[PDB]
Design a protein around this ligand. Structure first.
Ligand SMILES: *[C@@H]1O[C@H](CO)[C@@H](O[C@@H]2O[C@H](CO)[C@@H](O[C@@H]3O[C@H](CO)[C@@H](O)[C@H](O)[C@@H]3O[C@@H]3OC[C@@H](O)[C@H](O)[C@H]3O)[C@H](O)[C@H]2NC(C)=O)[C@H](O[C@@H]2O[C@@H](C)[C@@H](O)[C@@H](O)[C@@H]2O)[C@H]1NC(C)=O
Ligand SMILES: *[C@@H]1O[C@H](CO)[C@@H](O[C@@H]2O[C@H](CO)[C@@H](O)[C@H](O)[C@H]2NC(C)=O)[C@H](O)[C@H]1NC(C)=O
Ligand SMILES: *[C@@H]1O[C@H](CO)[C@@H](O)[C@H](O)[C@H]1NC(C)=O
Ligand SMILES: OC[C@H]1O[C@H](O)[C@H](O)[C@@H](O)[C@H]1O
Lengths: 261, 247
């Protein structure tokens, strides 16, 4: 089956705030930098993947420019990277230089922001969707007792309520940066607690942090990989109106979730 | 045998059923980067079938044989009678429903074949508890003019829901709303592409999670979403297991 060994594929890479990985001005010189930029059909947002672990736009290779954190990711001649292992993408969308362990990162959300190779901390600003379809995915999120997450208290809290199809606040926009956004106000992100004395999951202004990065795992959990923990119904009791961050256990059903889209 | 009865068909019960069905089917499953279990393959015919019992509003019961390689029905028993798709593994007769009066249905276990023979499509075939109930009845007596749509119903309500949480959830929403439904583009596009998604996922290993080909999955607003990699929650948090496709 030659289908099992695809020779290449051309796609986009979208990340923070739904913006795209873009070679600035489509410049083709060795070391021409990659940036955040609104998604479109332009050649310099087109990334071709290969079995050799190279990611290419404009015939050249996505790369780091430095062994230490803080420097731009660029495109360079692919011949230069002839003896390097290249990129590895984790199943959560972390794009990592195999050798240096540095990861594709967006230190700000605005258009034209320089992408840099940074130390991995599982922030949302380090989370990428590799894929031609770059739009947020609108969904309901179904948990315990078949109830829906609802955004509450003027979009400041979140908990389970009986699912209602019309209901605006039960709709969630799943961004390419692994954020879970209030559909109706996409500046607002579902966030793990910032007060250490609480585990309460809440809604806050999107900021690219570890607290706002979520992963829908094949095993039915909603994971925050940075905090090695998962979204959970407090005490397996939906009537407590509280969703917390917990270690992954099989003791109840409160760590099980479904996406309905 | 794993069991779902009409007399005890809540959302929770249905959910346990589908959950336990996935577990059983995925015993010995292999795993890739995606983490979605891949069904066993080249399984000896003596081990290839998993039996499930469905019971309707009469206290009446059929036992369906699921091929653990492809999560499809091969055959079923009703009392002293059994029925095999002509599609079935050709030795299945010697292994399942041995002392019954075995019969061959003159069609394959595929939606295409079933829709041609019955003259009716999934889009126009309702799904719900009483359709589940009645489908079982029609199969028990083997009333030939209802057998195809009965399969459309049961395949989707048992096997395709096992394949896809989305579909599981349509059946849950149906149970709780006390509302029948017909599948839309969203559900059908998953059914259509089970095989292709399995292939792309397994092939994606050699391209950092990226598919050799895009797959169109509709949402509930009938908008197409091109899934050309492993990085879509609508795939990853939906497809519960895959057909074995690549070494
Ligand atoms: C997004 O990426 C772009 C592309 O790299 C950044 O543009 C550049 O900014 C550099 C400074 O951070 C410039 O380097 C300097 O150039 C002047 C010119 O002589 C020099 O006086 C400076 O000392 C420095 O020269 C370097 O000195 C240190 C040495 O180690 C090094 O070898 C020297 O090159 C660079 O020329 C400039 N390039 C371009 C194409 O504009 C951009 O940097 C941000 O904007 C630039 C224009 C400048 O304002 C920077 O200070 C500012 O950080 C970067 N954007 C951001 C937000 O970081
Ligand atoms: C991944 O990171 C490593 C280490 O920073 C990069 O390796 C260097 O690559 C340059 C250009 O080929 C060489 O001139 C250096 O000698 C290499 N240094 C080391 C420590 O190996 C590598 O190029 C990066 N690859 C990608 C695809 O980003
Ligand atoms: C049934 O499947 C076979 C291959 O197994 C195919 O040749 C044939 O077209 C199908 N026939 C029917 C009865 O639809
Ligand atoms: O200024 C940035 C901008 O430059 C050009 O317009 C390119 O076509 C865009 O893709 C983008 O990189």
């Amino acid at each position: 089956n030659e289908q099992c060994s695809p020779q290449q594929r051309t796609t986009r890479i979208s990340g923070r705030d739904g913006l795209c990985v873009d070679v600035y001005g489509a410049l083709t010189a060795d070391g021409s930098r990659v940036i955040l930029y609104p998604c479109g059909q332009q050649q310099n947002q087109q990334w071709t993947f290969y079995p050799d672990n190279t990611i290419r736009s404009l015939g050249k290779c996505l790369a780091t420019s430095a062994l230490s954190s803080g420097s731009n990711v660029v495109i360079t001649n692919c011949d230069y990277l002839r003896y390097d292992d290249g990129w590895m993408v984790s199943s959560s969308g972390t794009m990592m230089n195999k050798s240096s362990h540095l990861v594709l990162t967006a230190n700000a959300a605005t258009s034209r922001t320089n992408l840099t190779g940074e130390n991995n901390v599982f922030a949302a600003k380090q989370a990428w969707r590799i894929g031609n379809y770059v739009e947020p995915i609108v969904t309901t999120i179904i948990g315990l007792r078949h109830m829906c997450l609802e955004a509450t208290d003027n979009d400041t809290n979140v908990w389970l309520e009986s699912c209602v199809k019309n209901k605006t606040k039960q709709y969630w926009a799943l961004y390419s940066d692994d954020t879970i956004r209030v559909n109706n106000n996409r500046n607002l992100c579902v966030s793990s607690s910032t007060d250490s004395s609480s585990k309460l999951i809440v809604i806050r202004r999107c900021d690219g942090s570890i607290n706002q990065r979520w992963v829908f795992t094949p095993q039915g959990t909603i994971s925050n990989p940075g905090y090695e923990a998962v979204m959970d119904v407090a005490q397996n009791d939906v009537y407590l109106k509280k969703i917390v961050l917990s270690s992954a256990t099989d003791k109840g059903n409160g760590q099980q979730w479904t996406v309905f889209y | 045998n794993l069991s779902l009865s009409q007399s005890n068909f809540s959302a929770d019960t249905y959910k346990s059923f589908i959950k336990n069905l996935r577990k059983q089917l995925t015993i010995g499953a292999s795993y890739g980067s995606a983490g979605i279990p891949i069904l066993k393959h080249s399984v000896p015919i003596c081990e290839r079938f998993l039996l499930v019992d469905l019971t309707n509003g009469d206290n009446e019961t059929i036992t369906l044989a699921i091929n653990v390689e492809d999560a499809g029905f091969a055959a079923y028993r009703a009392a002293d009678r059994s029925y095999f798709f002509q599609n079935a593994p050709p030795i299945a007769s010697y292994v399942i429903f041995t002392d019954t009066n075995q019969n061959i249905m003159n069609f394959n276990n595929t939606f295409e074949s079933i829709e041609i023979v019955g003259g009716t499509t999934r889009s126009e075939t309702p799904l719900g508890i009483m359709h589940f109930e009645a489908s079982i009845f029609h199969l028990f007596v083997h009333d030939e003019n209802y057998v195809p749509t009965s399969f459309l119903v049961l395949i989707q309500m048992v096997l395709e829901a096992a394949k896809f949480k989305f579909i599981e959830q349509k059946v849950i929403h149906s149970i709780m709303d006390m509302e029948d439904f017909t599948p839309g583009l969203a559900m059908l596009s998953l059914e259509e592409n089970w095989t292709q998604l399995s292939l792309q996922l397994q092939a994606s290993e050699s391209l950092n999670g990226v598919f050799g080909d895009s797959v169109s999955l509709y949402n509930s607003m009938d908008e197409p979403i091109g899934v050309d990699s492993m990085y879509y929650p609508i795939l990853t948090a939906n497809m519960a297991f895959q057909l074995y496709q690549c070494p």
